[PDB]
Each structure stands twice: as C-alpha cells, then as structure tokens.
Amino acid sequence: PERRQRIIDAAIRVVGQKGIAGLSHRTVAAEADVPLGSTTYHFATLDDLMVAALRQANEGFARVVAAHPALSDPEADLSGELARVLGEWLGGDRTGVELEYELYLAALRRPALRPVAAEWAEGVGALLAARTDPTTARALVAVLDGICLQVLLTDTPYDEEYAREVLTRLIPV
C-alpha cells in the first residue's frame, strides 16, 4: 500500500541498524512516525512484521533475477549470468543481503525457518534445476550463499571474475 510499506521499510531500517532485538511494534512505530495502532493494524504478531520485512528482501533479489531472463536461456552463459546477479545483489550497501542472513539467523533459531530460508533459493533452485540438473543447482545455490557470505563476513569487495570462475567449475559437460 503506502501506509504498510512505510511500516515495513521502517522495520527494515530498525534492524540492519539495531538487529533482531531492536525491532518491536513500538520501535517500528517510532521509526515510521506512525501510530502504534497502524503498526498493529497491519501486523499482529511481531513475526508478521519480520515475515513481511524479509519476504520483501526475498522479492528484491527475485527482481534482480527476473532482470536477467538469460539465466533460463540455455544459449546464454550460465556462470556469467549468475556472477552478474550476484554482482548486482551486492553492489550498493548490502542492505537486503544483511537482511537475508539476519533473517536466516532469526530463521535458524525459530520455527520461522521457511520464509527466509527456502523462499530465497526456491525460485533460484527451481530455475537452475530446470536449466541444468538437480545436483548442480543445489551446488550453484550453496555457493551463491557462500560467496555472498564471505563478502560480508570478510567485508571484502565482490570479485566477479572470481565468482564466474567458481560457478563455472560446478557446471558440467
């Protein structure tokens, strides 16, 4: 909408800046300059807020993906295309990727494993599987996360030639 978006976005800012533990209806209300009542009208559980909060992250990346139709194209360079999705998803200030692991964190611990968890590589994996084979796809997916992980945990800049190379090795024939 735009009421509820302001809210989610605020939840978003509250967390990369104060983490899983700094975000509650009241703190999101503050950050959004929005009544608590609005806040709760749109999100009953604190979960729904974090759930929406992430699924948005998840939709942001799927929009980087959807911006490279070539991935599903067999004539196109698979490795190359993936390294460029990763190059984009990271270029900027990582914010949505901070979210996705921050999410993965709250996820692991919680029974809210699934939305953050699978949703990410569900579409990616589904696409990669169709475009290669199941094994490769799980491998491709696992390395996306790894590569991304490294880039944040080590705070290094993304090496696109590098990912391209790595990805190519997991791709057969």
Place this chain on the structure above:
Amino acid sequence: PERRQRIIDAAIRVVGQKGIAGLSHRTVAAEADVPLGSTTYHFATLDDLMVAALRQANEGFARVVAAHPALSDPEADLSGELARVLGEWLGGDRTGVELEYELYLAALRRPALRPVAAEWAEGVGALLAARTDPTTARALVAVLDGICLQVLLTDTPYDEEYAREVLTRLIPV
C-alpha cells in the same frame, strides 16, 4: 580453567536457546549458577563473553580439522576428507554451527566481524591454499559455509556423497 569454562559454556547454552539478545552477564550468571561477580571477573565487556563464547566454537571445528591430518596430505583424497570434516562438524545437534552463524550474524552487524568471521576459514583457507591454490581454497571455503548453511536453513540432513561431488568439481587438474 573450570570456573570460566562453566561460564562460557553457559553463555553458549543461553544463546542457541535465547539468541544474541538473551545473553547478558546477569543471564549467563543465572544459567551458570555462578555469581555475577565471577561472571564479570572473567568477562568485563559483554563482547569478551560473546568473543570467548565463539572462539570456543571456532576451536571445536579446528579440532575436527586437526582430527583429519590427511587434508594436508597430497596423496589423500581432498574432496573426500573435507566431506568427512563437514560430516562430523554437523553430525550431532549442530550446536557449534548454530553458534558460528549466530556469531556471523552478530559479527556482520558489529565491528566484531573478525574473530567469528575470518578465524573460521583462516586456518582452513591457509591449509587449503597450501594444499591447492588460492582460488580453489576460497572456493572450497565458500562452499563449506554454503553447504553447512543449507543444512540448517533447510533443516535437511547432510548429504555426504553430495558434498563430496560438489567439492570435487572445485578441485582442478
């Protein structure tokens, strides 16, 4: 020691069970059935507690690694050996791996990036680099994390044949 160990271990239990946000001198003191004063005598900053708390995780895995000397042996099957380190590090109830990402989380956000962060793949990467080449080693490392990640985020059981296969593809000549 055994005073300070009880403390760290307790910090350990407090978190996989209440996360980054459920662990403080007072809550660690409670869990440890140990005076707050003990708690602080051994750890001034809340960081030192989380810092020790993790570095222990980090030392647990390096003890799985150190239990496969073969990794540094060129006659030995590299892929095979790594898939078995991963098989061990995961077999059980993931507890130290929960820690390492939970750590990676608190790490990312914080300037405490390094201990959790690098320390993990610093020794692994150093060993792999020496035993292969730098590129491969970064790749191997990135996929360890990925594979591990998946196994927790998807809550699936580790497929050792799978990792073996994946790892082999990143290994050249």
